[PDB]
Every structure is written in structure tokens, then in C-alpha cells.
Point group: C3
Chain length 111, copies 3
């Protein structure tokens, strides 16, 4: 049924909690939905193992939500896959993945 990819590139608290809230809201309002969360730039800090949002990220991952980190930004930010929480996947490009997804018919949400 529904397919949607979220986009977050900041790590300020209110924006992060809004994304989280939007992801949960969406899973409850739509019968069937596939969700991906693409985070790049400062936004990747949310996917770090030492992140204050790790509980939220690990829990949603268990519910089928796929979090994607940008292969490029990572380097740019002195980060590698070892710094990311378990369950978080890496895509070659945050924006590229978003464009591919949109091109494949996925809906786009930028909280």
C-alpha cells in the first residue's frame, strides 16, 4: 500500500521529536505503510549509537522502520558505520536515495 520516506537534516530536539512523532502517527493512521527515514548532515547525529534518541530509533526499527544514513555525509563528518546504532542502514547518498525513492512512487515528507 503506502510508501513514504522522511527527510531530516538537522538534529535540534524539536525537529527530531517531530519526525519521531510523525512516524508513529503515520503507522497508526494508515492500515499499511512502508516507512524509511533518511538523515544526512547534522541529521545523522540522530542515528549515532551514543544518541539520546537511540531508544526511539531502535524501537521503531523493530517495528519495520528503516533508518538510512548518508555514505557521504558520514565521511564528511568523521564517521563510519561503526559509529551508527545497530539496525541503521547506510545508503550511498541521502538525497540520491530520496530522489530514487520518489521516482519509484514513494511519498515524501520533510518535517
Amino acid at each position: 500500500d503506502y510508501r513514504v520516506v522522511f527527510h531530516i537534516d538537522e538534529d535540534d530536539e524539536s525537529r527530531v521529536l517531530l519526525l519521531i512523532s510523525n512516524v508513529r502517527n503515520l503507522m497508526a493512521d494508515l492500515e499499511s505503510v512502508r516507512i524509511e527515514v533518511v538523515a544526512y548532515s547534522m541529521g545523522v547525529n540522530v542515528l549515532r549509537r551514543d544518541s539520546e534518541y537511540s531508544g526511539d530509533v531502535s524501537e521503531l526499527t523493530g517495528q519495520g522502520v528503516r533508518f538510512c544514513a548518508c555514505s557521504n555525509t558520514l565521511r564528511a563528518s568523521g564517521m563510519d558505520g561503526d559509529d551508527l546504532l545497530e539496525g541503521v542502514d547506510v545508503v550511498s547518498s541521502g538525497v540520491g536515495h530520496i530522489v530514487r525513492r520518489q521516482t519509484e512512487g514513494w511519498a515524501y515528507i520533510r518535517p
Copy 2:
């Protein structure tokens, strides 16, 4: 012809005036366009009866613009439909409505 849904989740002045401006600009640049404005989180404060933007909201409603408040956020914010300006509609979910709309072919704008 054209169908577009706007997304606003903040209530800071500059962002609100930008949305308003974008809605009017759009109605003047496109021959035929159907417009919906989905506001959630802090963004719903813009749809309140006591809002400083009530004049702008009521006027655009008269021009065919449909403003939608999130059924969930409302509660979360200690609000119910009685707190909303007349003409403002309530959708079950702000993000869900946006995803359904995008899925139905509507364009998406996030000022």
C-alpha cells in the same frame, strides 16, 4: 488541473507569512488549482480562532483554500474542534492526509 497540499508544522511569523504568500502567489500564477493546507504540531496554532492570522485564514477559505488540522495533534495540544476558526476542517492525521494526497497525485510544498 493542478492540486497541491502545503505542509506547515511551525508557527513562527516569517514561516506563516511565507505560507500565506505562497498560497496567494499560487492562485494567481496557475489558471486552475486546488489547494489544501495541512498544519500540525505548533502549526495548528495558526488555525485557532484567537489567532492573529484568522483574517488571512478565513479569507483564503472563502477563496476555496481548505485548511486541515490534525485530529491527533489537537488532543496532544489540549485542543478540540471548538478551538478552531470556522471553515477549518479536521483530518484524522496531518502526515497521513499528506501521504494520501501525494499518493493521489497531489503536489507537495513545504515552505
Copy 3:
């Protein structure tokens, strides 16, 4: 192949550099992609001849990136085409152009 239009309506440094970075990242991660950057409101200041980002804008233009300024905002901002960097094009409406593009199948990215 891929077609994408970026949307920027602010001129704060971090947001501008993020857009620039996203445009370059995209050109390197996608084999074939057509890119347009629509800037309105404060965002048009980025397309000014006297802008600190002129080097970045002129360079990307040479690489095929099309920057578009909003015909309306310009006036609203006491600006005309003479104030814009060479290579920057003017569209009748920033949001309208974005809606037309999305309607034509282009992907949308709002950094």
C-alpha cells in the same frame, strides 16, 4: 533519467551550504540527473550578483544546474533581473514552477 527541483526560501549560511552540498552530492551519486534550484523569498538573495555564493552558483550553472528566481518575490524585494547573477533564470512564480515541475514528474527536495 532523473529530474529534480530543489526548493530554498531562506538565506542563512548553513541552509545554503546544505543545498549546494546536496546538489553536488546528487550529481555524483546519480548517473544521469537534471537539476533545477528554485529560490524565493529570502532565498533569492543567494542568486544576487553581489552574493557570497556567486562562485558556487556560477560554477554549478556551468555544470548544467538551472537556478530560478521568482518573478514575484523579486519585485516584492525591490529587485529585477539586472540584480541577478548571469546564468540565473527567472520563472513567473517560484511555487508555481515547483508545482508544474512536480506535476510533470520531477522529484522534489527541500533541504
